[PDB]
Amino acid sequence: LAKRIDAALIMKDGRVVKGSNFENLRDSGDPVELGKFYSEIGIDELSFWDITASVEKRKTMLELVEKVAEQIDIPFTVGGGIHDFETASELILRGADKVEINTAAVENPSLITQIAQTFGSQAVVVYIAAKRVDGEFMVFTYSGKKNTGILLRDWVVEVEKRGAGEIVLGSIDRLGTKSGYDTEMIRFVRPLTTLPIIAHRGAGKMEHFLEAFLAGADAAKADSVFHFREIDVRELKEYLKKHGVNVRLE
């Protein structure tokens, strides 16, 4: 397949957290308008991650999914506190193509299988946040607050066994940096799974995306570098095509 470029949007109370610099938009903090714009200039898939306070979270997330599905024609994923099958199910039925889970999947891996039984493996994305600890890649939950003691190597294999469709590999060792994706981690994981691997954390310039695809990533996901216009999505795709990467061009 072609290599995918994904844009992630953090959301709270129906707004893009910290907005975006796209002066041309009516509302640069409007997740729907911004995702529609990204879909027009060349992003392949969108991810939305909600951090709304529990009282309004369920209906805020369902309303977002509904508005996005009407307005955009590329696949999109929703996540943020999805803890059970009925919550994932209503978000998929309401419009999302995929649901993203992490901590809830670590604590109950059968939740992967439960969702895949009704919506297909392709509807399940498992985010794996990993960090070096004493020379081993370990899995972390609760926004990186908890070292689970589960080896990355073992969790990847279990996630595919349980029926997940894709893995987002987020390197806590690259959080808040602009040094590049964790290509050592990507090369570690690549021989362990047949599933699509989405690289996350570390992006600072176009060349980093090339490095991630040489490391075996099937997609690369970024956020602030896009929203704050440090990297132009069309220039990135032109750059990657120029140097031999198969990406989808318009």
State the CATH number of the domain containing residue 160.
3.20.20.70
- Spatial separation of the C-alpha atoms in residues 101 and 126, rounded to whole Å: 5
* Helices 85-93 and 54-71, axial angle in degrees (round to 10): 30
Which tokens sit at 21?
A: 């610099």
- The distance from CA 154 to its chain's CA centroid, rounded to whole angstroms, is 21
The closest alpha carbon to 222, from 165, 173, 177, belongs to: 177
Count of structural domains within the chain: 1
The region that residue 19 occupies, defined by phi over 0 for left and psi between -120 and 50 for alpha, beta otherwise, is left
Which tokens sit at 204?
A: 């600072």
Please give the residue range of the domain that contains residue 210. 1-250
- Are β-strands 219-222 and 136-141 bridged in parallel, bridged antiparallel, or unpaired? unpaired
Q: Taking a C-beta distance cutoff of 8 angstroms, is the pair 204, 177 a contact?
A: yes
For the CA atoms of 235, 194, 147, 201, the dihedral, rounded to the nearest 10 degrees, stands at 0
Phi and psi of 175, rounded to 5°?
-60, 135
Q: From the CB of residue 215, how many other CB atoms can be counted at a distance below 10 Å?
A: 21
Cited resolution, angstroms: 1.6
- The distance from CA 65 to its chain's CA centroid, rounded to whole angstroms, is 16
The closest alpha carbon to 166, from 189, 149, 140, 145, belongs to: 189
- Spatial separation of the C-alpha atoms in residues 35 and 142, rounded to whole Å: 27
194 forms bridges with which residues in the sheet?
Answer: none
Range 59-65, long-range pairs (CB < 8 A, 24+ positions): 60/13, 60/14, 61/91, 62/90, 62/91, 62/94, 63/14, 64/11, 64/14, 64/31, 64/32, 65/91, 65/94, 65/95, 65/96
- Spatial separation of the C-alpha atoms in residues 148 and 61, rounded to whole Å: 28
- Spatial separation of the C-alpha atoms in residues 232 and 249, rounded to whole Å: 14
- Spatial separation of the C-alpha atoms in residues 250 and 240, rounded to whole Å: 14
Which tokens sit at 201?
A: 């954390």
Going by the DSSP 8-state scheme, the letter that residue 3 receives in this structure is P
The closest alpha carbon to 126, from 154, 98, 153, belongs to: 98
- Spatial separation of the C-alpha atoms in residues 44 and 117, rounded to whole Å: 26
The closest alpha carbon to 36, from 87, 70, 81, belongs to: 70
The closest alpha carbon to 172, from 183, 182, 187, belongs to: 182
- Spatial separation of the C-alpha atoms in residues 156 and 216, rounded to whole Å: 15
For the CA atoms of 199, 130, 17, 73, the dihedral, rounded to the nearest 10 degrees, stands at 30
